[PDB]
Amino acid sequence: PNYVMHTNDGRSIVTDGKPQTDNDTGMISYKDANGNKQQINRTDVKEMVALENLE
């Protein structure tokens, strides 16, 4: 259930698992390619493209 988030500042961020709204901040919480939690404003996320599970 990985994704490639296309930001509005010209970035393509790969995620580990499906991101989701942070219960505390309202920001979008996601796990980077290193398994580290990160937060990005939904406003800066244009779209999320699903990556096929290749195992």
Which CATH number goes with the domain that contains 33? Answer: 2.30.30.100
Using H for helix, E for strand and C for coil, what is the string for the chain?
CCEEEEECCCCEEECCCCCEECCCCCCEEEECCCCCEEEECHHHEEEEEECCCCC
Residue with tokens 């996601």: 30
Which residues form the domain of 11? 1-55
Q: Is 28 exposed, middle or buried (CB count within 10 Å of its CB: 0-12, 13-18, 19+)?
A: buried
The total number of structural domains in the chain stands at 1
Give the integer Cα–Cα distance in Å for 19 and 11.
16
Taking alpha carbons only, the member of 55, 53, 16, 12 closest to residue 34 is: 16
